[PDB]
Amino acid sequence: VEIAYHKCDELITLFNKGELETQPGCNEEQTLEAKIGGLLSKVREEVGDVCINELDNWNAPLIMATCGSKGSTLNVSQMVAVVGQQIISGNRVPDGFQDRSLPHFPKNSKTPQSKGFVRNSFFSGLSPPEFLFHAISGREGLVDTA
Amino acid sequence: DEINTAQDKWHLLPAFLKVKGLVKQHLDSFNYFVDTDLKKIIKANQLILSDVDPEFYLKYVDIRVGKKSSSSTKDYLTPPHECRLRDMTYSAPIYVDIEYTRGRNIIMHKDVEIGRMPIMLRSNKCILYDADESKMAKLNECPLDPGGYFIVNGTEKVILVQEQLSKNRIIVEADEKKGIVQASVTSSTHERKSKTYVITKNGKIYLKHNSIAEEIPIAIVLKACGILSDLEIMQLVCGNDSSYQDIFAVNLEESSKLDIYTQQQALEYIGAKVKTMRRQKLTILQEGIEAIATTVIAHLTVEALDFREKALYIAMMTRRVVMAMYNPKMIDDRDYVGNKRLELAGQLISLLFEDLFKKFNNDFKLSIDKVLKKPNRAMEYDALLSINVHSNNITSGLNRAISTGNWSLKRFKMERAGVTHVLSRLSYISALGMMTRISSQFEKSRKVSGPRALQPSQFGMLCTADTPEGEACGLVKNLALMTHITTDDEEEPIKKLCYVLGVEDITLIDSASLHLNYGVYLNGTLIGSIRFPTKFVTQFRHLRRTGKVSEFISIYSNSHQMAVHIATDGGRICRPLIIVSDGQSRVKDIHLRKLLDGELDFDDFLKLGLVEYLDVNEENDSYIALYEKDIVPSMTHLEIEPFTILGAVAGLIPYPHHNQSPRNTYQCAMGKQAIGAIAYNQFKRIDTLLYLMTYPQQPMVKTKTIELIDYDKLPAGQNATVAVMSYSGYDIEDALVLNKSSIDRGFGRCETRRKTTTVLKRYAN
Amino acid sequence: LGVPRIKEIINASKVISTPIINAVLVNDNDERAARVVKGRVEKTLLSDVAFYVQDVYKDNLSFIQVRIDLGTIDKLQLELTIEDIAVAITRASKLKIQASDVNIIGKDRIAINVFPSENDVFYRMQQLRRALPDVVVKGLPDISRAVINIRDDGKRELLVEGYGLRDVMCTDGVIGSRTTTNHVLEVFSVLGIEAARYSIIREINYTMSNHGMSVDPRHIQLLGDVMT
Amino acid sequence: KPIRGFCQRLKGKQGRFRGNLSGKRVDFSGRTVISPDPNLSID
Amino acid sequence: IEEFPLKISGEEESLHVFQYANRPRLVGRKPAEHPFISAARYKPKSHLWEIDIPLDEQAFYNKDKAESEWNGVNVQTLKGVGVENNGQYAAFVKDMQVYLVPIERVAQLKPFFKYIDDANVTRKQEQNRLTGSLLAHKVADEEANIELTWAEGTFEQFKDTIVKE
């Protein structure tokens, strides 16, 4: 998780003050937005990959998600190892305030963990601004079906 | 145990919540109502003057509620209990003092009762204010009741908190196709009016209104706004450089070709093109019909006697929309709490009461007109005895209005439905849960998902958990544990003080500046336009935090849009937190220890400048921390108790963060449907429908919130063992399995109480 | 993609949102025809290549001065030298403005003269000024934008958003034999009937074969037949 | 305000059409909650 | 280190300050241009001061248009609205000490024409209830006629306030 942070921090310091090759996804700031979305994605799945692999036999959630009962390997992975990238609307947590997610974060927030990202599982608990982000996606998906 | 920095921060909430109760809203507003509003409304019309007879005049000197002479109060005012049993309403008499004058040349006085009026529970004028123990046992009623509700005509109903869009403020929205639109709404006394600015085509912009028939070429309007010189206008709404010139230059071009001046065709255009004249005393007709128009119908509150104030304001209103016409974004959407303001029932009752009083006036004036047109024996009285039997129109009129929920206004003429709601009593939570709940009105469609999903700005000012899953989703919210609703202070003593701080009058300023720094806006109105924002902000906040004007009137800087805002307009949520000066907190140990032991209570920290309230768009400018450990000394403020984010109803769930938001939402709805023991007076109380529990028990795992709200004293549920296993096969999907002889010693044993009412009447026979 | 797209089909409305059109060109190559047919069919480069637009008044003559920079037309491929924009300039003249005169001297400078409520000439020219850097030099009046994308494994081709169809199919440089277009109702206006019925059952099957399950081939064909 | 007595009662093709119009008269019926069992064969 | 003394002068008829947004800076050695010929009209409070400035026949006068519509040929007309705000003083430095004379009321100057309102009329031609705006209008047009002769010279403007120390 930490090795996936400063790498994006190295990419984001080149955002305003530097130049980089941009995909034909049109204009700027969407370029790294697709990159930060791709990087943190793989890292998430990768962390949860080794988790279930080394998990002990005869356990209930594995066997239950193994056969017919309930859920999938993706579900139990969020319980134990890590969650990540809560996303509504097709993008990342649009700013409620001016150029910032929450007042608890510095102005111009491009930082990972500052927007729609949580490195904590359901077991370990949730940091205070790891919560509201999850409340969003929960509210969004709930009103959707309704 | 020694006093640490972590322990005391949690002790702050009990000190805060003990002074101001869980429900501030209804109480505080009703108390302000019966004193301030009552004396102000009667001051609006203190006189009634009718035409006949050589001279007649009548003056109301003072109006009070159920208090005069040596009597502290009514001999015996019916308690809440007995009032509920006899189906009678809950009310106190209205005492008035009037001065009567006849053609017998007399000046005298008296004390009369114009009618009744409902009194809310737990109020200064109630019998339950500051009472303890045996006082309640004698009055036959429960000490733990939340209060703050109106009981009339049998059962009891509650006035629900209603949200309202921003009043007297500029809001700008952008649209595909046609163009950009900004809306302006306000109310001055009797009437409410809405202005709509619009750009149809060409970049040349128009002004729509219900007063003026056809859209006016604003460049002509601005001429009628007192300005002549043209390019001064361009240098105002556009100013110095870039692309802002050519766009507005189009309208500027073709406006002055056919008709150009600041006087002659300016007014005469508007007045000839203007709609219906109201038919009475109409002919002032001249360039002056637009004069009274260019003041009153001039689209906003500004007015007064000059053309300079209003002009620049409309120009600055034109300033912003031409900026978003250039490129997308750069606008203000209407979603978040920052642009929203909630209004407590205190103002609503005043609006409804003043209407019935106005209706009485003309009828009372015409009442004496009868004998007035009668030939002989001019009458001294019967303005006493006859109006007494003529009265009670206020009584029944207000009682029917509060019972129905349909309010009829002849002034604003706004008929509002679905205001009052009957308080649902099932458990102890449902009573406290329905209160402290934010409702909403209109804003059109069910289809639009815009005003539905939660927004990050809601954090800490509202409950992010509680919500009534169903047809209505997200349209009704709830307040958090620690919040404060803003009142209104005053206007005049700010400007004069602001001038002392070095800001100057807008009149003396040559009006062609987009160039020097920011400018100070008072409730949206440009006044000072001062340099050096730093010393302006800091010193002003210092005068706030320390010796004067606490709570509201907060100042915040605007970086991109160039200005500095000062808003004194109340009716908004406020949240407490702690100031960190330099690198460390302002609290510092031994202070809070002096608190918990013997003294120092609350609201003293505001005097010492420790804790205060952020608000409005100022919460955006500041910087808030999480924990005392996390502090990096770039921080303006820290936060006290981060777990206050959830509402009062959502504080029941143990380990909420371990779960997911959809699970916590369902519990908030089901948690109030649980069956408790309700109150202590419960056995002496006759309800319409009620469910009871036999052997209630507290939860094995408690919460810090449930103790402060007094939950476990009146718990709802049965603490029981359990096992997680696949057994039965009558279990399977979402179905449990119970055990006999556990249930035969009883489990969750209930009781169902209903009632029936009959009346023996008497006909005309 | 999802259900509101099926709504667009079932309703069979005239217009529709982002109606992309697929077309094949010749073969798979990076240069020439790839970017050639790309710069051929869309909008107006007039406001782009215009360099600087000058407005001059000398003595008794009124002058509109637009001098085109040759640098852009060289890099961005459009087929003409000067006169074909001059006939495109007179197209604009014939459409919304006037038929008077046109001038050609050097560096692609085009002069416009006008002459006859008082002082109308100034107000006339004022409107003709701003309206000039708009009108289409080449391409059609349809396409909102185009894209060159990698087709299949290694191949290349383009997709176009517009109501054009036949005209861009008639447009030289591309093979129009095998193509496709959305909003079936308009396909009925060119191929018609059968081919349109074959297209409407093609899109219905596609978009509903992605999100999940199966609707089977049988039930779809009957739905498109009873309509057609 | 509206007193409309004729063309109206023939209307109401939406909202409560599901409940009132076609759901008013159905005889010999019943309703109750649900609960599982292994022992009952299907059908 | 040192000391700069300042004083506060007395009443002395008070003052009224002119300002106009028309003329910009000429960027030359002397930026300001001096208005002339005076001819101001006056009335009671909210007086609407009128400013008159000459017109030159030498440069770009366009005579053929004048003889046709407005025969004016003459001094330009400017007007403006006066306003007052407390706590504003004026200053002038004499020797090593500073002296200060309070300004009082302030006024803005922007023009208009009677060649308009009179021309608009001649082109077109061939009780208890009121307050505020029009009350400042109906009374305005009626009560204003005053001829003020502006004469500029200064001697005692200092010594009058100076001896008050």
Next chain:
Amino acid sequence: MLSFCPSCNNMLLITSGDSGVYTLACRSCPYEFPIEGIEIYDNVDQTKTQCPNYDTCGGESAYFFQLQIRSADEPMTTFYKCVNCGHRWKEN
């Protein structure tokens, strides 16, 4: 053109002068404007062929490129490039 007339300082519009002259004057105010008005707003492959480009050039060497364009029956279009000047050339 967005001009203005000192003193009154409103705007300057073009008015047609009598008999051949074009002038401009401020509305409602006497004035005349003489002058000119203005405004402005803003390689391996080789083949043998004769080079049409001539300064001193007269170059023998050239480059060529091959692609099929337009219709299938429509012949091949070739693109010539010169060594010395580096000029691109196109003919079918």
Next chain:
Amino acid sequence: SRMTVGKMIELISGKAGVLNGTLEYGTCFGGSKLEDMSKILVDQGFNYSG
């Protein structure tokens, strides 16, 4: 599928509270630790978790 781990922890914190004869606290973002409950259990002869 419903994915709530907060309930499964409640039993341990609840069971440990009864053995000590004390009501066990819990709250969002903090509160009584799960680990100390295990050692409170295991010394009385119960398996550490549940």
Next chain:
Amino acid sequence: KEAAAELELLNADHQHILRKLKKMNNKPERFMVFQLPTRLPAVGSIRVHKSGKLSVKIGNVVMDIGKGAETTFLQDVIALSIADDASSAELLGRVDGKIVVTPQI
């Protein structure tokens, strides 16, 4: 960089305003205008603070210091003499500077 940019101007302004104050010294007519808070509690006067700073003040234990002004370069200003409603209109000539004074701690 909030405090930075402002203190940079405060230094400069406290110098520049001192020059144009002493640049117009002798008899030729040059005028400046002041803005002060009301109620006028009582006087003390202006002068350069130690180490080149600038501090105004009044007497009897009070310190009031402020300088600078909002952007100039438009205004053509002169105050005129009006008395008794009788014809006066006396022009003292031109204007030079502008300054405001804010109180402080």
